[PDB]
Amino acid sequence: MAKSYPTVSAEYSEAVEKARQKLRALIAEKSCAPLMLRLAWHSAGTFDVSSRTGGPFGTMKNPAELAHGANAGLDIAVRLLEPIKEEFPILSYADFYQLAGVVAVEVTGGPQIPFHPGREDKPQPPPEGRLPDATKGSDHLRQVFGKQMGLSDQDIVALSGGHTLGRCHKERSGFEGAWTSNPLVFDNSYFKELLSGDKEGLLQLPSDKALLSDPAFRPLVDKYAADEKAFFEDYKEAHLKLSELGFADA
Ligand code: HEM
Numbered sequence: 001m002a003k004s005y006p007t008v009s010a011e012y013s014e015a016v017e018k019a020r021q022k023l024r025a026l027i028a029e030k031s032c033a034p035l036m037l038r039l040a041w042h043s044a045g046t047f048d049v050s051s052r053t054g055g056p057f058g059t060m061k062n063p064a065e066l067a068h069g070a071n072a073g074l075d076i077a078v079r080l081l082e083p084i085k086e087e088f089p090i091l092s093y094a095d096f097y098q099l100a101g102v103v104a105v106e107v108t109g110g111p112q113i114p115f116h117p118g119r120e121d122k123p124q125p126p127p128e129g130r131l132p133d134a135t136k137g138s139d140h141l142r143q144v145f146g147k148q149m150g151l152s153d154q155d156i157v158a159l160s161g162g163h164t165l166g167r168c169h170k171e172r173s174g175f176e177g178a179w180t181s182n183p184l185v186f187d188n189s190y191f192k193e194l195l196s197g198d199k200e201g202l203l204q205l206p207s208d209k210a211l212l213s214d215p216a217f218r219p220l221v222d223k224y225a226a227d228e229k230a231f232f233e234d235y236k237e238a239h240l241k242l243s244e245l246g247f248a249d250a
């Protein structure tokens, strides 16, 4: 009951479904689901509840936001998706990029995240600096996910499982390597690798390691490493909330 979703026309809903189908095909055919999940997450994760600025309002299309250091490489994702967007002028960029994130999780075998249309494309990007610093720890994660976005500790650990997909690139973030041996498969391998420690061929960031030493985050790591179904359930709920920060709040 925290949300009151807006009414959109049948044509809008039809466009969402047709765009979803095109996105499912492109994301699978181009093997770019991890990048598209990162696109949706960096679009949404800038929300600060105290000012109601940032969030999933289409601003990743804005070159000034693409130029943020944390968004290096997301210009590639925007350009890859633009041919589909051109076929769906009725849709907001805000909805379109969140739909791409939901599709990225689906096509890699993850949970089916509900999707509710109607986000507006806002004119101003957030200030740079809202997203998490990979070199910091649990206090910082709580400032970013909790104080800014309004999400719970469970949400932090579940969403960190997005690193089950993809990898870091030296020219984008400056880190280099994948968290998992199967980076196109949405599963609980991220948490299993965290628990087994550093090892040749795989990466862990300081922010990942902070989940192991924190007394509230660690039981959640243990749970998700042991129980993929529980991870999928909590991930679905957290991704839904993330994708709707500042949107349709009652
Ligand atoms: C918890 C704090 C987080 C930190 C510090 C963080 C940091 C990073 C960094 C440094 C990269 C590498 C970017 C590059 O070099 O290409 C990355 C990639 C990625 N992030 Fe996170 N991230 C966080 C949370 C999340 C969340 C919440 C999600 C989604 C639910 C997510 C999904 C991804 C994905 C899928 C990639 C790989 C992209 C690719 O393969 O191109 N991350 N993250």
Ligand code: NA
Binding pocket: 164, 165, 180, 181, 182, 183, 184, 185, 186, 187, 189, 190
């Ligand atoms: Na994986």
